[PDB]
Design an enzyme around this catalytic site. Structure first.
Site, PDB file in Angstrom:
ATOM      1  N   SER A 119       0.865  -1.206   0.000  1.00 26.67           N
ATOM      2  CA  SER A 119       0.000   0.000   0.000  1.00 26.67           C
ATOM      3  C   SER A 119       0.894   1.246   0.000  1.00 26.67           C
ATOM      4  O   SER A 119       0.370   2.357   0.130  1.00 26.67           O
ATOM      5  CB  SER A 119      -0.967  -0.038   1.170  1.00 26.67           C
ATOM      6  OG  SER A 119      -1.972  -1.028   0.965  1.00 26.67           O
ATOM      7  N   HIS A 165      12.831 -13.080   7.147  1.00 25.51           N
ATOM      8  CA  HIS A 165      11.896 -14.188   6.796  1.00 25.51           C
ATOM      9  C   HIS A 165      12.140 -15.381   7.732  1.00 25.51           C
ATOM     10  O   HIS A 165      11.629 -16.482   7.427  1.00 25.51           O
ATOM     11  CB  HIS A 165      12.018 -14.554   5.299  1.00 25.51           C
ATOM     12  CG  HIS A 165      11.395 -13.582   4.330  1.00 25.51           C
ATOM     13  ND1 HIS A 165      11.226 -13.877   2.977  1.00 25.51           N
ATOM     14  CD2 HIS A 165      10.873 -12.344   4.504  1.00 25.51           C
ATOM     15  CE1 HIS A 165      10.667 -12.849   2.375  1.00 25.51           C
ATOM     16  NE2 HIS A 165      10.437 -11.894   3.290  1.00 25.51           N
ATOM     17  N   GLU A 204      16.933 -15.418   1.351  1.00 20.09           N
ATOM     18  CA  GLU A 204      16.492 -16.646   0.637  1.00 20.09           C
ATOM     19  C   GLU A 204      17.708 -17.368   0.055  1.00 20.09           C
ATOM     20  O   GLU A 204      18.568 -16.745  -0.543  1.00 20.09           O
ATOM     21  CB  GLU A 204      15.501 -16.328  -0.484  1.00 20.09           C
ATOM     22  CG  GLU A 204      14.172 -15.724  -0.024  1.00 20.09           C
ATOM     23  CD  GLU A 204      13.480 -14.804  -1.034  1.00 20.09           C
ATOM     24  OE1 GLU A 204      13.579 -15.098  -2.236  1.00 20.09           O
ATOM     25  OE2 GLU A 204      12.852 -13.766  -0.612  1.00 20.09           O
ATOM     26  N   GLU A 228       6.679 -19.484   1.774  1.00 18.55           N
ATOM     27  CA  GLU A 228       6.999 -19.922   0.394  1.00 18.55           C
ATOM     28  C   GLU A 228       7.141 -21.439   0.318  1.00 18.55           C
ATOM     29  O   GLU A 228       7.412 -21.932  -0.786  1.00 18.55           O
ATOM     30  CB  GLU A 228       8.291 -19.265  -0.109  1.00 18.55           C
ATOM     31  CG  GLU A 228       8.302 -17.750   0.006  1.00 18.55           C
ATOM     32  CD  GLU A 228       9.565 -17.084  -0.519  1.00 18.55           C
ATOM     33  OE1 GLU A 228      10.211 -17.654  -1.443  1.00 18.55           O
ATOM     34  OE2 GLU A 228       9.895 -15.992  -0.024  1.00 18.55           O
ATOM     35  N   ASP A 256      18.800 -14.574  -2.370  1.00 20.20           N
ATOM     36  CA  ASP A 256      18.194 -13.231  -2.160  1.00 20.20           C
ATOM     37  C   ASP A 256      18.845 -12.689  -0.897  1.00 20.20           C
ATOM     38  O   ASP A 256      18.478 -13.109   0.209  1.00 20.20           O
ATOM     39  CB  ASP A 256      16.670 -13.234  -2.045  1.00 20.20           C
ATOM     40  CG  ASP A 256      16.078 -11.831  -1.978  1.00 20.20           C
ATOM     41  OD1 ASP A 256      16.837 -10.837  -2.069  1.00 20.20           O
ATOM     42  OD2 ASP A 256      14.857 -11.729  -1.900  1.00 20.20           O
ATOM     43  N   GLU A 309      20.421 -11.750  -5.781  1.00 19.56           N
ATOM     44  CA  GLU A 309      19.339 -10.743  -5.839  1.00 19.56           C
ATOM     45  C   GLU A 309      19.585  -9.735  -4.722  1.00 19.56           C
ATOM     46  O   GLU A 309      19.831 -10.177  -3.600  1.00 19.56           O
ATOM     47  CB  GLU A 309      18.000 -11.463  -5.716  1.00 19.56           C
ATOM     48  CG  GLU A 309      16.822 -10.548  -5.449  1.00 19.56           C
ATOM     49  CD  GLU A 309      15.510 -11.317  -5.311  1.00 19.56           C
ATOM     50  OE1 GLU A 309      15.460 -12.496  -5.780  1.00 19.56           O
ATOM     51  OE2 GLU A 309      14.555 -10.770  -4.712  1.00 19.56           O
ATOM     52  N   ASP A 317      15.587  -6.661  -7.388  1.00 20.53           N
ATOM     53  CA  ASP A 317      14.179  -6.757  -6.925  1.00 20.53           C
ATOM     54  C   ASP A 317      13.774  -5.404  -6.335  1.00 20.53           C
ATOM     55  O   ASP A 317      13.122  -4.612  -7.056  1.00 20.53           O
ATOM     56  CB  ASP A 317      13.962  -7.924  -5.957  1.00 20.53           C
ATOM     57  CG  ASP A 317      12.620  -7.907  -5.235  1.00 20.53           C
ATOM     58  OD1 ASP A 317      11.654  -7.403  -5.814  1.00 20.53           O
ATOM     59  OD2 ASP A 317      12.560  -8.393  -4.078  1.00 20.53           O
ATOM     60  N   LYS A 371       7.212  -8.531 -11.077  1.00 21.89           N
ATOM     61  CA  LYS A 371       6.028  -8.695 -10.228  1.00 21.89           C
ATOM     62  C   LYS A 371       4.893  -7.899 -10.863  1.00 21.89           C
ATOM     63  O   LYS A 371       4.911  -6.663 -10.753  1.00 21.89           O
ATOM     64  CB  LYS A 371       6.345  -8.241  -8.799  1.00 21.89           C
ATOM     65  CG  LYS A 371       7.390  -9.096  -8.094  1.00 21.89           C
ATOM     66  CD  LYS A 371       7.871  -8.559  -6.753  1.00 21.89           C
ATOM     67  CE  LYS A 371       8.783  -9.552  -6.066  1.00 21.89           C
ATOM     68  NZ  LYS A 371       9.503  -9.001  -4.889  1.00 21.89           N
ATOM     69  N   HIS A 428       6.633 -14.715  -8.080  1.00 19.82           N
ATOM     70  CA  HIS A 428       5.538 -14.786  -7.082  1.00 19.82           C
ATOM     71  C   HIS A 428       5.637 -13.607  -6.101  1.00 19.82           C
ATOM     72  O   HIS A 428       6.623 -12.837  -6.172  1.00 19.82           O
ATOM     73  CB  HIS A 428       5.575 -16.130  -6.361  1.00 19.82           C
ATOM     74  CG  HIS A 428       6.715 -16.274  -5.419  1.00 19.82           C
ATOM     75  ND1 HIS A 428       6.773 -17.294  -4.514  1.00 19.82           N
ATOM     76  CD2 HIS A 428       7.834 -15.536  -5.240  1.00 19.82           C
ATOM     77  CE1 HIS A 428       7.879 -17.188  -3.809  1.00 19.82           C
ATOM     78  NE2 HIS A 428       8.544 -16.112  -4.228  1.00 19.82           N
ATOM     79  N   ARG A 429       4.638 -13.488  -5.227  1.00 22.10           N
ATOM     80  CA  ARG A 429       4.659 -12.686  -3.981  1.00 22.10           C
ATOM     81  C   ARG A 429       4.539 -13.659  -2.803  1.00 22.10           C
ATOM     82  O   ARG A 429       4.258 -14.831  -3.019  1.00 22.10           O
ATOM     83  CB  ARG A 429       3.558 -11.628  -3.981  1.00 22.10           C
ATOM     84  CG  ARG A 429       3.581 -10.739  -5.216  1.00 22.10           C
ATOM     85  CD  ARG A 429       4.841  -9.917  -5.420  1.00 22.10           C
ATOM     86  NE  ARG A 429       5.199  -9.070  -4.271  1.00 22.10           N
ATOM     87  CZ  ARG A 429       4.886  -7.774  -4.116  1.00 22.10           C
ATOM     88  NH1 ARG A 429       4.192  -7.110  -5.013  1.00 22.10           N
ATOM     89  NH2 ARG A 429       5.284  -7.127  -3.045  1.00 22.10           N
ATOM     90  N   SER A 430       4.878 -13.198  -1.609  1.00 19.32           N
ATOM     91  CA  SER A 430       4.712 -13.914  -0.320  1.00 19.32           C
ATOM     92  C   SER A 430       3.271 -14.386  -0.169  1.00 19.32           C
ATOM     93  O   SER A 430       3.062 -15.562   0.237  1.00 19.32           O
ATOM     94  CB  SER A 430       5.061 -12.995   0.823  1.00 19.32           C
ATOM     95  OG  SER A 430       6.424 -12.701   0.749  1.00 19.32           O
TER      96      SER A 430
HETATM   97 CA   LIG Z   1      13.493 -10.107  -2.833  1.00 15.79          CA
END
Ligand SMILES: [Ca+2]
Ligand SMILES: [Ca+2]
Ligand SMILES: [Ca+2]
Ligand SMILES: [Ca+2]
Ligand SMILES: [Ca+2]
Ligand SMILES: [Ca+2]
Ligand SMILES: [Ca+2]
Ligand SMILES: [Ca+2]
Ligand SMILES: [Ca+2]
Ligand SMILES: [Ca+2]
Ligand SMILES: [Ca+2]
Ligand SMILES: [Ca+2]
Ligand SMILES: [Ca+2]
Ligand SMILES: [Ca+2]
Ligand SMILES: [Ca+2]
Ligand SMILES: [Ca+2]
Lengths: 424, 424, 424, 424
Positions: free
Chosen positions: C43, C155, C164, C205, C242, C283, C310, C335, C363-365
């Site tokens: 948002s 994460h 990641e 994920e 990542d 990334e 990203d 994305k 993808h997204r989370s």
């Molecule tokens: Ca990322």
């Protein structure tokens, strides 16, 4: 069932030079008809698809295509029942049926005729214009035209060493305006030639080949023409050249304006010309096998000017891949009938695109009323097309197709010259 | 409901000379689309339909056709909902909407574009080829082509007084063979010119305009070309001429090969030429208003040679009717955009046919990729077509259409030259 | 008429994390239905499309999407009657209706839901699979999957600094085999964790986040897993990371394995890791605004390893264009819901492709059962996809779609890893 | 002719745990396509259908389903030409083709995949949603979801003896509200775990398995979560348990919270728990073969709490019929792939319904993106569904389907919890 191939026919027609060529007609079970004609090719060359000529000296000076037309009967046997939507399957089926690397068996002219006629049939089946059929929903870019106006070298009887001098309306807001700028410069050029008492008969591509003394005279003529039509050279209408250096290369030497040059000399000639003149592109500036010197030319001028391989690459993905690896050229001429299927052409454009090379969709000397290369240019967002001068409808029909495409895209129409997909 | 007109669109495209012209697109309620393009016309002349030019000097040297294209919007308002099958109703509706005798208001170029696009739409609706749509089940005659090869007068920079020298393959068994004979003679001609060091750049119609000294030199060149290609002049390949005498007529005198002649002199020149040379046809041998002398020319040579009115008749049924009454000519050039509707063209061909005059379906200098005149020739069994030389695809596309028509007629295909519907 | 939009509906559903998101349903006049769901977005963010949340604290912890769902009613008013085939027109219509740069008004989540549902509707209308609808007849490349297996940084609850660690089956002959290699390595990894008494609960994920001490421990774990499954690290199964360096960057310093580093230190850490480990991609190795140091990283490792932006690019064509100009990265995460229309996503992939950057479809989370990104990857020949680990069907459904696509392409199926369109 | 089976295809895909499973695709002569995927089953058990695994140790740890996928070829031979509307005929045809009681020959996974794909094909053929296709015009009841949140026993590494603790939004006015209550309780639970420093990685079903000390700790956690989300335990959100007593039953003794119990002890434990806690349902409270003690449990708590047989009945109509005869349980878990056809599943639900037993439509541990069990629940007015926690889209996709169903039923939508078709 509807997209399945029901019938494939071919006949012997004439190209724009009055020489035989192939057209094919593909009927689908749903009544969809696709018709395509093939331009003049070559029966010779290591890395080029071979068109099949009859070599019957008592017909069309041995340039008949009865054998290629008959071979389409063998393609029909192989393809009847396949979906016309499966372009790659269809193209692979013809490649295997031929079973030779350069399509010597069936003929490139037979194979490409069916390849395009199938694609036209399939787009009509789906009620899509061919550019959208091939390119998907982002196929919205009108190419900058590189427009023949003066000819030299093997394409003239004069003392101009370079083969083609072109204008490119890089600065126009639309293809519709770009085409008008081209036509007005071409009519201003005609008037200048008449006023200087130079010949205004046109050659194969609809341009002029007056008896000029040098490459410089050609460039000065185009600048006069541009200015007389009221346009700004470079900013509005830029220049391009087909050097076809292979034509004047003998033993590591290039003969140019009466003098012999070593590669480094020829490079220097090209560098002086882009300094003095608003030249945004040079095709075959060095010989088709002069790769170390191509590497230097690209290193020196590559970031300042487009360097198009034509004879350098012959629309061959191995030569293009080698070029990409060695930093040779930054642009490639795309000739459908030099590779022989739509699939392999699209693979070659994708390979150029992914590597930052510009694709220039090209006519042949022997062209037809076919307009496929216009749709091909928009489908692939190639950004450039080379389809001759501003006379002869085998050239003009491609621009009329581009006008129909631009109108149909409406508010989604983009001009390559305005969005950075042009030569510069 | 299906044949009813749903939409009529037009746009500004380019002809074969790089000058604006009109194309129209007609959509029927059943999804049928007809597309037609109009060739270059005239904005002037008492008995000719007037094409509408924009006369805006800052666009296309004032040859824009934005106004004609806009007028198609007013034709769409008038014709939406009418059956495309009712060609005569449609053509009369546009004639009344224009309300001027020479179609000055909407433009001949606007009216003819819709007239042809409607006919193409209607034939597609009925799934009939256009020749069959217009001509019914006896539309089975392939015309003898009169093929431009050498130009003089106002169409050249040379000392040839006559405007066009043509070959006609009168002796061929089929249009497919007739076309090959034409192409082989054209390539033999090119070789003769190169070997004599004469220019081989082509003009508007795809023919040569070398710097020749006389009409005789032109005729001798065509005879050499025919013989070098291995054909018999007269029996196999005959000659035709466009004298365009209006170009060299001043005060009851015709200037021809350096000398001034009275009508009786010019007639004698024409009579000597048909004696010495296998000339089967002569167009505009005398001036467009020289009717008493036209009557003598027709009386003297009319039973031995075709005498074509072009500027004499300007595809005008009143001038043709006068000619018929006075024994003037025995043949008429038919130019769609000189009269401005398909209906009025067909009326004019019917008038010629019923009176024993031959109809020669004619191109214009500014042609397009449109092939309507090929179908028009077969529909009306005209027996002759004049659509330029053996190069430039605005010329070649008509011959390719005739090849498609001949193939589709199959065992019903007749060649005019073999069944007595040719010039001789 | 059939492809015209008849109805557009939306409802509030749940993503893979149990949080509201939008789905849209588009009905065409021919009965074609397209359904699409949108993943979790943001948002907030200058260069990202803003998804619209309700911020009602008494529903779904203020993450309701009733307002976005209601805004689809305003999109239906705007789009009813437009052809679903005109993806660009549709997407531009929603962009203008919203009238804000970051789609704050209607919501990115509302706009993207209609954007994808329209494309699905249109492909169903033409009876084309979505990859072929979007990519044309060369859409034949299955991507190399970058498969999450170990998580750190924000994460996880552990001492792993990087976010990641992924495996990539670069050496497989097909996507079907590549997927099996992934799954076998994932099951071998689970067994190693159990045997070491480490937690095997999965995160968003579908990967593991065991309490490991360092980035090194993570890389060593993946090497053990690969070898235990019987595959060769690098040649068969390579590694990717990542780094999400933004997470541990404070004042020109990066905190990594207990120490603070200057950019040159962090670069050195990355260079040592690619020396010691078969890492083919990194990334966000440096912070989203660290451009001069990104330029050095790219100069130093760019020709030896993929450098994915990203947070660096946020699927924004201006940031990507800046990156391209400055030699920053050679790859970009794509994305859909970060930019907010299918058209703008395809423009951004085209921009990456033409400039020699690799597109990694992401993808997204918060994901859904939607499989659009699988078709998107094949349509654009992106060559890579990032869609999570080997558990949770919001991840697995993309691989199952890729299996259906590979089967349907048949003998035309190509794997990116085998044809040079992978990371390396 | 249109509903006749034209084609049946299967392929090997992955379930939500990264293990092979079967999907089938059924094409009808009218172009209708039904696609279904099968969840993880068992290859073992007297009263259960046997899924067919390949047992090839070099592929997918021997869990390949190439043999089941190949067997679908033998089903296609048997079923091609049969109406897809004749579900019972189709299911009986596959049962006979297999010819074994537990479908060992073709595989339960092969048979169920075709069984569901046929039903989806047939509903699409009739343009009916699957729930309406199967249930007729009274299929209007949205089930009360039993939503996994805490795991113990064989599904965890902790000291919780019971296998699953679930919430059930029995008090909601609609499925749409029931789903929101579930999600809010799940997010409140996550927060409580984080705040207590307990692990929040999720297991197969998308729930938590923190290291808790007892069944009591699990129940107290759910009560805290419910209250923190602001709901009333029992009245709004009730509790349910999967005891899976078989896991801790050895020699007439049940080990529970460190102590060994005789059946009468275990019964007492269950009776104390339903006294102290708002537990509305208990699954496998006693061992799968402990029938005399099941009879006592049912006699004692049966009128006050739901007593679900899972391992007790294994969706087997003979075991269920025995249970009904002996007053054992009052509810049965329904697993499609435990019996192996849609017909036999519907027979088993009908048998439960007619005898006053509640049907609880159940997921498996290894689930897919398939949503059939949502439609199955509404078709049969089962009133309950067990399809995991509030994360992982193989769980969430069933709730999203139920939201689509509730929206489509409109004013006819009933929630089981509000009309007395729930657990209580
Ligand atoms: Ca990322
Ligand atoms: Ca169709
Ligand atoms: Ca020369
Ligand atoms: Ca060239
Ligand atoms: Ca505009
Ligand atoms: Ca019809
Ligand atoms: Ca002259
Ligand atoms: Ca004339
Ligand atoms: Ca015959
Ligand atoms: Ca359709
Ligand atoms: Ca940490
Ligand atoms: Ca193969
Ligand atoms: Ca039906
Ligand atoms: Ca335990
Ligand atoms: Ca259980
Ligand atoms: Ca209500």
């Amino acid at each position: 069932y509807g997209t399945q191939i029901a019938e494939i026919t071919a006949r012997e027609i004439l190209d724009s030079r009055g020489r035989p060529t192939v057209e094919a007609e593909v009927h689908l079970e749903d009544g969809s008809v696709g018709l395509a004609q093939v331009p003049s090719g070559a029966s010779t060359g290591t890395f080029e698809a071979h068109e099949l000529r009859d070599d019957d000296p008592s017909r069309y000076g041995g340039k008949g295509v009865q054998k290629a037309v008959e071979n389409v009967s063998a393609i029909e046997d192989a393809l009847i029942g396949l979906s016309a939507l499966d372009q790659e399957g269809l193209d692979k089926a013809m490649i295997a049926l031929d079973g030779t690397p350069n399509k010597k068996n069936l003929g490139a002219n037979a194979i490409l005729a069916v390849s395009l006629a199938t694609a036209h049939a399939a787009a009509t089946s789906l009620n899509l214009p061919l550019y959208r059929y091939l390119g998907g929903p982002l196929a919205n870019v009108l190419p900058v035209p590189m427009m023949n106006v003066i000819n030299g070298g093997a394409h003239a009887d004069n003392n101009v060493d370079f083969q083609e001098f072109m204008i490119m309306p890089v600065g126009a807001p639309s293809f519709k305006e770009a085409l008008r700028w081209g036509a007005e410069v071409f009519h201003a050029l005609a008037k200048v030639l008449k006023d200087k008492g130079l010949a205004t008969g046109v050659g194969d591509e609809g341009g002029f080949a007056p008896n000029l003394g040098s490459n410089k005279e050609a460039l000065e003529l185009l600048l006069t023409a541009i200015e007389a039509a009221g346009y700004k050279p470079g900013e509005q209408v830029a220049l391009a050249m087909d050097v076809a250096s292979s034509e004047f290369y003998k033993n590591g030497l290039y003969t140019c304006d009466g003098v012999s040059h070593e590669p480094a000399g020829m490079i220097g000639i090209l560098a002086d010309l882009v300094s003095q003149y608003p030249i945004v592109s040079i095709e075959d500036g060095l010989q088709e096998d002069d790769w170390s010197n191509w590497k230097t030319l690209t290193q020196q001028l590559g970031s300042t000017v487009q360097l198009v391989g034509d004879d350098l690459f012959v629309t061959n993905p191995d030569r293009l891949q080698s070029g990409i690896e060695q930093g040779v050229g930054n642009a490639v001429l795309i000739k459908l009938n030099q590779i022989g299927t739509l699939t392999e052409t699209l693979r070659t454009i994708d390979l150029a695109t992914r590597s930052g090379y510009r694709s220039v969709i090209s006519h042949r000397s022997g062209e037809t009323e076919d307009t496929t290369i216009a749709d091909l240019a928009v489908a692939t967002r190639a950004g450039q097309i080379k389809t001759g001068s501003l006379s002869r409808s085998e050239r003009i029909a491609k621009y009329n197709r581009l006008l129909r495409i631009e109108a149909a895209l409406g508010e989604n129409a983009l001009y390559a010259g305005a969005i950075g997909l042009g030569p510069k």
